[PDB]
Amino acid sequence: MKQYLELMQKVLDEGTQKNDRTGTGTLSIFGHQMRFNLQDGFPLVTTKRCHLRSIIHELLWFLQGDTNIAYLHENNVTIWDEWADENGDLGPVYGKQWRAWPTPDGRHIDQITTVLNQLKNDPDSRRIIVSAWNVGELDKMALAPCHAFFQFYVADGKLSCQLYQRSCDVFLGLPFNIASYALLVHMMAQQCDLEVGDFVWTGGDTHLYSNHMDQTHLQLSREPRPLPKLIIKRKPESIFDYRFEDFEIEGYDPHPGIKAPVAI
Amino acid sequence: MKQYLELMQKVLDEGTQKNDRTGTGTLSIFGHQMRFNLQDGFPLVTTKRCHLRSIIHELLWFLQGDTNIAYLHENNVTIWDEWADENGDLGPVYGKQWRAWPTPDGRHIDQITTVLNQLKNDPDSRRIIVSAWNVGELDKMALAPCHAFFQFYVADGKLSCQLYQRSCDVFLGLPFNIASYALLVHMMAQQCDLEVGDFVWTGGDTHLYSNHMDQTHLQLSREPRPLPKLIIKRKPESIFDYRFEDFEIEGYDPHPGIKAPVAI
Ligand SMILES: C#CCN(Cc1ccc2[nH]c(N)nc(=O)c2c1)c1ccc(C(=O)N[C@@H](CCC(=O)O)C(=O)O)cc1
Ligand SMILES: C#CCN(Cc1ccc2[nH]c(N)nc(=O)c2c1)c1ccc(C(=O)N[C@@H](CCC(=O)O)C(=O)O)cc1
Ligand SMILES: *[C@H]1CC(=O)NC(=O)N1[C@H]1C[C@H](O)[C@@H](COP(=O)(O)O)O1
Ligand SMILES: *[C@H]1CC(=O)NC(=O)N1[C@H]1C[C@H](O)[C@@H](COP(=O)(O)O)O1
Ligand code: NA
Numbered sequence: 319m320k321q322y323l324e325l326m327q328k329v330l331d332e333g334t335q336k337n338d339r340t341g342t343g344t345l346s347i348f349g350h351q352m353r354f355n356l357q358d359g360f361p362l363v364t365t366k367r368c369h370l371r372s373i374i375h376e377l378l379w380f381l382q383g384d385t386n387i388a389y390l391h392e393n394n395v396t397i398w399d400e401w402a403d404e405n406g407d408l409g410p411v412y413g414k415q416w417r418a419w420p421t422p423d424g425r426h427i428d429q430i431t432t433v434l435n436q437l438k439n440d441p442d443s444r445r446i447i448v449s450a451w452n453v454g455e456l457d458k459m460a461l462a463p464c465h466a467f468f469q470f471y472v473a474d475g476k477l478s479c480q481l482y483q484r485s486c487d488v489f490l491g492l493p494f495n496i497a498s499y500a501l502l503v504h505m506m507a508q509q510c511d512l513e514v515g516d517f518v519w520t521g522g523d524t525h526l527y528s529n530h531m532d533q534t535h536l537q538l539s540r541e542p543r544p545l546p547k548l549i550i551k552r553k554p555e556s557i558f559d560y561r562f563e564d565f566e567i568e569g570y571d572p573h574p575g576i577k578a579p580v581a582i
Numbered sequence: 583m584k585q586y587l588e589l590m591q592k593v594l595d596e597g598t599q600k601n602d603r604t605g606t607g608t609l610s611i612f613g614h615q616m617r618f619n620l621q622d623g624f625p626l627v628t629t630k631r632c633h634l635r636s637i638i639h640e641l642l643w644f645l646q647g648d649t650n651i652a653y654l655h656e657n658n659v660t661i662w663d664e665w666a667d668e669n670g671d672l673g674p675v676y677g678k679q680w681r682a683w684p685t686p687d688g689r690h691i692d693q694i695t696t697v698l699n700q701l702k703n704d705p706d707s708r709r710i711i712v713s714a715w716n717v718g719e720l721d722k723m724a725l726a727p728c729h730a731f732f733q734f735y736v737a738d739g740k741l742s743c744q745l746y747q748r749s750c751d752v753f754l755g756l757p758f759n760i761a762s763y764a765l766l767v768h769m770m771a772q773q774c775d776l777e778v779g780d781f782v783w784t785g786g787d788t789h790l791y792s793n794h795m796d797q798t799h800l801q802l803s804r805e806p807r808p809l810p811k812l813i814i815k816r817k818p819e820s821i822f823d824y825r826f827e828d829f830e831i832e833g834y835d836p837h838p839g840i841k842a843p844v845a846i
Contacts, residue, residue, distance in 0.1 A: 334737045337706050348735040348742050349782035351615040420686040421718025429717060442600045444749035444787040445726045451713045453693060454685030462709045467731045469748055469786045471612040473598045480613050480786055482746045484733055485708040518613035520784050522733045522744055523708040 344525035356514035359545025383417030441472035476515035546570035607792035623809025647681030705736035740779035810834035
């Protein structure tokens with residue numbers, strides 16, 4: 319996509335070398351923002367073939383409140399394998415915080431239900447927030463939350479969302495993160511009888527791994543194709559009752575896939 | 583400042599009308615970003631005189647972990663009066679979360695101490711975060727955190743910080759928020775023997791109150807002046823040991839202060 323290739327080029331033009339946790343090394347910038355008007359089309363990268371089925375299953379898994387990879391394996395999705403323990407557990411990562419953030423007095427807060435009720439009852443609220451950054455549980459998580467903090471907004475009958483992504487693997491992770499949040503906006507909008515607005519993506523440490531540079535430049539040589547179109551075939555009774563088969567992506571005509579290794 | 587006035591003009595030109603919590607009404611946009619290179623000067627708005635005494639003492643109060651306004655009153659700072667209870671308490675707002683975030687099991691994390699140790703021991707980390715958005719304590723806070731989530735970053739010997747500000751009163755709040763985080767970067771850089779980098783400001787619901795239009799037109803008629811310079815006159819033993827008298831803002835030549843009532 320235009321915005322995505324422009325970000326790649328910005329990291330290349332303005333980034334600096336950094337060592338990193340994984341021992342791989344990155345080229346890194348700090349701070350970026352871009353927007354996707356979801357009425358233009360569904361923002362799935364076209365300059366390489368992306369594995370959409372994994373994106374959908376990962377989001378459904380988050381929405382169930384799950385943090386063990388068994389459900390992903392049942393659906394032939396392997397994207398979380400490298401960080402799970404011997405029983406498949408990642409600890410209290412995204413799904414757990416989204417559905418059941420633990421409070422100091424023994425409560426748990428379902429932030430997804432909270433947001434939905436805020437959008438329906440008080441859409442001009444400035445507090446329509448989900449946070450995965452539960453400071454008191456970070457040490458139990460297999461990785462710290464990358465897509466950390468997000469906010470909804472309504473104007474002119476349209477639902478928008480902004481994500482603060484504190485750490486972004488531009489080549490491997492970002493295509494998934496953009497599509498995932500776009501899908502969530504569509505689902506949330508359907509449940510609220512709203513149209514879709516913008517997905518606003520904001521980055522913290524926004525980086526290209528040192529072993530993704532040939533792949534990145536191959537991708538930058540390619541022209542984006544038309545955005546595909548997302549069709550939802552049913553309105554479930556709640557945001558938690560979607561199924562994989564409720565979604566179809568039309569007109570997706572990507573350039574060939576480009577393989578790259580993930581940094582563990 | 584140029585970027586601040588561009589944002590103010592953008593809210594006027596593009597903002598849509600909201601019926602907010604306070605009943606006042608706003609013009610609002612969603613999703614914006616600005617960048618202040620702190621080596622270009624200290625980013626204190628010059629198109630009105632900003633009350634440095636209040637900005638500095640509020641930050642020192644946060645760093646103490648204090649959420650009662652008595653300390654502010656001892657220093658003739660009244661910016662939090664309208665939301666405090668009869669005992670001066672605001673509940674577990676910024677200072678409490680920064681210094682004593684409660685875990686579910688009865689422990690505490692001092693996020694500021696953690697960040698200082700990350701900057702000194704793991705400056706490449708992508709996890710150097712402070713969150714005030716403690717979902718499980720929102721119901722006890724007098725207002726929800728505006729400056730909600732922030733991140734530090736180190737590259738080539740320079741310390742940067744990005745703030746996610748989920749709700750921004752462009753007229754009254756934003757000049758304080760920019761200066762406060764810029765001052766924090768200078769203090770942390772001093773304690774870590776780093777140079778200052780960028781302050782990146784990211785906004786969610788970014789608004790002008792409907793009773794601030796005259797004041798907005800006045801400020802937009804004024805040209806910005808060169809930025810001042812921050813001088814730290816004493817290097818304290820830790821990030822927790824600063825005092826108001828340690829700071830001097832040199833070369834600050836603002837236009838006159840503008841009087842505008844806060845929306846409660
Ligand atoms: C974000 C996110 C979700 N996740 C979770 C996740 C977990 C740890 C991470 N660690 C690192 N270093 N980068 C990531 O982006 C990252 C992402 C993903 C993990 C891997 C791939 C990936 O390897 N994609 C390959 C193969 C896809 C496939 O299985 O077919 C690709 O070519 O796209 C994508 C997303
Ligand atoms: C951000 C932040 C901190 N805070 C906390 C705070 C609390 C509630 C809020 N509520 C609303 N509606 N807007 C705010 O920006 C806001 C800010 C501030 C509160 C008031 C002023 C203010 O009235 N400033 C005036 C007068 C300053 C003085 O001389 O006392 C000004 O002219 O600047 C500034 C900051
Ligand atoms: C993390 C998971 C995700 O959804 N998106 C990403 O892009 N993620 C990337 C960011 C880093 O490259 C890595 C996490 O490592 P750190 O915790 O930042 O060291 O995964
Ligand atoms: C809140 C405090 C701060 O530091 N900055 C701000 O700009 N703040 C403004 C934002 C809103 O106008 C108001 C808070 O009200 P909501 O919780 O957003 O309804 O104060
Ligand atoms: Na798969």
